[PDB]
Design a protein around this nucleic acid. Structure first.
Ligand SMILES: [Mg+2]
Ligand SMILES: [Mg+2]
Ligand SMILES: [Mg+2]
Ligand SMILES: [Mg+2]
Ligand SMILES: [Mg+2]
Ligand SMILES: [Mg+2]
Ligand SMILES: [Mg+2]
Ligand SMILES: [Mg+2]
Ligand SMILES: [Mg+2]
Ligand SMILES: [Mg+2]
Ligand SMILES: [Mg+2]
Lengths: 60, 236, 140, 130
RNA sequence: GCGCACGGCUCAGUAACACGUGCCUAACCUAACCUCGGGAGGGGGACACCCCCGGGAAACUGGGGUCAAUCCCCCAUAGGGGAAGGGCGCUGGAAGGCCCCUUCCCCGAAAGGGCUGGCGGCCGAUCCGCCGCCAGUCGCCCGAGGGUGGGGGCACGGCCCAUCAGGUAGUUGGCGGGUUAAAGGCCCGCCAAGCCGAAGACGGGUAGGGGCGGUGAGAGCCGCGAGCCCCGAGAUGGGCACUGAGACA
């Protein structure tokens, strides 16, 4: 699980960096795929902080 | 802040012994604390529409009561001299006029009269742009140009349009006008201003009103001119 | 001295606690808050990339008194606290005398809080993708 | 400020020279005062806005370098620099310790000037050339 | 955010501007509320709860991550203060005040935020929001006045003792300053010898003051002047501060 979780955090930080750059479509794509992975593998509440950060970033 | 019933003003139409130890304290509004009555007290003890403070506060919070053209939803709102009180669901319109017996009473007035308020000028100030701010007897203010402010003096009266925010008419303090005593002992007396002793302090000058042969005396601070031989607004 | 070190990954939001002992005890003693020690020292406890440097963020003593970064030396002190680090006022403007300890690590410390430092330009995986108790609850 | 160390309340002495008892044991915060805040002659102007009674504000010149010197013989205002304090007639200790108070004489670049402002209360040194 | 500085208790201190009556502040501050006039533009930040870990006996409390505001800050303008000069004008019994003009220095606002309904647009069920306009409504900021509370000043009135006759030395006053929201030996620098007292200083004793209460035919005497209302002071003794419109709570 640790490899999958760490890889998910990498895609989350890359999504937040792209969102900070302004690439909202790319960040939304990364968020959707990482969200699907978390929903299937049960890591949603584990990645709850980064999900909230990326959602706030894409709202901004 | 609390108001002990003993410290409540003596003219208020409430019992002095039978009841609780508290009285509804007016909420620092557009009158004096000792020359005004709270709106809940008006609704419960003056009109008898509400049997408790809860019912009075419900009636006030619905916005059924209007004071001087503005809906008042605060149950502690002060009500004072010459204020127009309007009940919305019933259509009844009162003026808070000076009274010989209750010292201050709600007398019904016409709907055409309900939009006017006779306000006694209480002072003048110079404000920015060179304008003149008139301060009236209930704390209301009106900013005017200097030429109109120059000819209006202290202790004059103005009939003021609440809806237009304008001075409908100006009644200067001259000998022979009709005046009403708005304060102490000789309260509610209407008569002709026919005699003055001008003390060094103008507010403390001795004034005498006449109603045929009925001569009463007060100080200049305690009278308000309500026009010539016929009062402009229905006060009685 | 024996320690219960919390190590926080700033990229995963998680933390892991290791009981630190005899060889690393003298390495942790003598360090002021914010000091820099490379992550290779924790090779026997955690597998870190060779770009992560562990910074000393704080600690708590034998009786729970937290390390105040604004106080120097390895000392126990009473301060009239009005701010967050060592005091959480329940009323606005309320000041209190609160026991704290210095920024220097001693042997009376029971908890040491430290956070990773990833290298500049790093874009790899987080050092701690999950907590131990979190993984245990996930598995069950 | 409102400090009990600089209490401005009444004395305990009557006009007949005798003592009188204390009507109130504690010192009122309303009657408290504050320490002197007159500026010291320094290398740059440092100003500090302080909250006072009723939430108002007072500007304090903790250190003063420049003075608003007025020449009435030219009807002009010049922002001059204070070289030194020549005298403090209210108290020589002020000039000796290089403190500027109202009525103090200061040698600015335009000449000698009398301080016509309260520098501890106004936060600026308005001066008049002599 | 607002409130908790009201409300509740008690009678040690106090013979005093404490209290009562009658006046002041032209020497002052005031959140909430009222009215009149005006304003609301640009930008930024952090800390909770929470998640991952705790430490400590408990009290309490540490590190990392992360979402906000009517939370915190900067910028602009409005506005404000100080010094000086001038003026028809305002108030007021009387201007050291207000307004107008002039010069410099200095400080320096705001939440168009919430809701309702309507319109339009962006966006997506991994969303259930965001944005632009309108109306209603509750709100925010500046100026002036009021209201309320508070600080301060004045004249007079109410105990016993001379087996207490001289007391006072910042004491009394002046001048210049500091501090204060504001006058003041309130405090400070200099200058003078002044100030109180037999119409009783000073010293001691007793006591919270008043509305009021008991008694007597009344004058009067007494305080059961405990309970009820108003003002005062205090929170084991003595001090000192934070926040805040307001406390030295
Ligand atoms: Mg009380
Ligand atoms: Mg605000
Ligand atoms: Mg002004
Ligand atoms: Mg600004
Ligand atoms: Mg904002
Ligand atoms: Mg002064
Ligand atoms: Mg003295
Ligand atoms: Mg007898
Ligand atoms: Mg009792
Ligand atoms: Mg004590
Ligand atoms: Mg206490």
């Amino acid at each position: 699980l640790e490899a999958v979780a760490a890889k998910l955090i990498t895609r989350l930080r890359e999504a937040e960096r792209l969102a900070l750059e302004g690439k909202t479509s790319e960040a939304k794509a990364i968020l959707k795929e990482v969200l699907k992975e978390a929903r299937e593998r049960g890591l949603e509440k584990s990645l709850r902080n980064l999900l909230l950060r990326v959602k706030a970033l894409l709202r901004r | 802040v609390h108001l002990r019933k003993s410290l409540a003003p003596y003219w208020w139409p409430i019992p002095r012994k039978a009841g609780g130890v508290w009285a509804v304290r007016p909420s620092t509004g557009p009158h004096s604390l000792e020359y005004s009555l709270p709106l809940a007290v008006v609704v419960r003890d003056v009109l008898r529409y509400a049997k408790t403070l809860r019912e009075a506060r419900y009636i006030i919070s619905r916005g059924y009561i209007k004071v001087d053209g503005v809906v008042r939803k605060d149950y502690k709102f002060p009500i004072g001299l010459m204020d127009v009180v309007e009940i919305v669901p019933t259509g009844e319109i009162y003026r808070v006029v000076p009274d010989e017996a209750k010292y201050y009473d709600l007398k019904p007035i016409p709907s055409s009269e309900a939009a006017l308020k006779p306000l006694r000028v209480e002072g003048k100030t110079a404000v920015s742009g060179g304008r003149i701010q008139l301060h009236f007897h209930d704390g209301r203010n009106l900013i005017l140009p200097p030429d109109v402010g120059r000819q209006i003096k202290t202790f004059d009266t103005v009939v003021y349009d609440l809806e237009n925010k304008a001075i409908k008419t100006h009644l200067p303090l001259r000998l022979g006008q009709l005046a009403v005593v708005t304060h102490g002992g000789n309260i509610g007396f209407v008569g002709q201003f026919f005699e003055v002793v001008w003390t060094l302090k103008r507010r403390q000058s001795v004034v005498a009103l006449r109603k045929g042969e009925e001569v009463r005396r007060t100080i200049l601070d305690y009278i308000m001119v309500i026009g010539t031989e016929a009062p402009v607004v229905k006060i009685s | 001295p024996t320690f219960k070190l919390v190590l926080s990954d700033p990229l995963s939001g998680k933390a892991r606690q290791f009981e630190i002992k005899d060889p690393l005890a003298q390495r942790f003693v003598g360090l002021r808050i914010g000091e820099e020690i490379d992550g290779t020292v924790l090779k026997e406890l955690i597998e870190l990339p060779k770009g992560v440097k562990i910074r000393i963020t704080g600690g708590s003593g034998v009786e729970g008194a937290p390390m105040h970064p604004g106080v120097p030396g390895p000392v126990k002190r009473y301060i009239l606290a009005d701010g967050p680090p060592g005091y959480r006022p329940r009323k606005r403007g309320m000041r209190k005398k609160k026991l704290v300890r210095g920024d220097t690590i001693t042997d009376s410390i029971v908890q040491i809080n430290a956070v990773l430092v990833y290298p500049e330009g790093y874009s790899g995986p987080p050092a701690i993708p999950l907590g131990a108790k979190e993984l245990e609850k996930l598995k069950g | 400020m409102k400090l009990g160390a600089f209490y401005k309340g009444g004395d305990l002495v009557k006009p007949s020279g005798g003592k009188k008892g204390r009507v109130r044991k504690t010192k009122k915060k309303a009657l408290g005062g504050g320490p002197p805040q007159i500026p010291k002659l320094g290398e740059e102007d440092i100003r500090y806005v302080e909250r006072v009674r009723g939430g108002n504000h007072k500007v304090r010149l903790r250190q003063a370098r420049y003075a608003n010197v007025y020449i009435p013989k030219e009807r002009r205002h010049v922002k001059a620099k204070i070289l030194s304090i020549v005298s403090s007639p209210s108290n020589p200790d002020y000039a000796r310790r290089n403190y500027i108070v109202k009525g103090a004489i200061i040698q600015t670049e335009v000449g000698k000037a009398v301080v016509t402002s309260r520098p501890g209360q106004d936060g600026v040194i308005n001066a008049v050339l002599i």
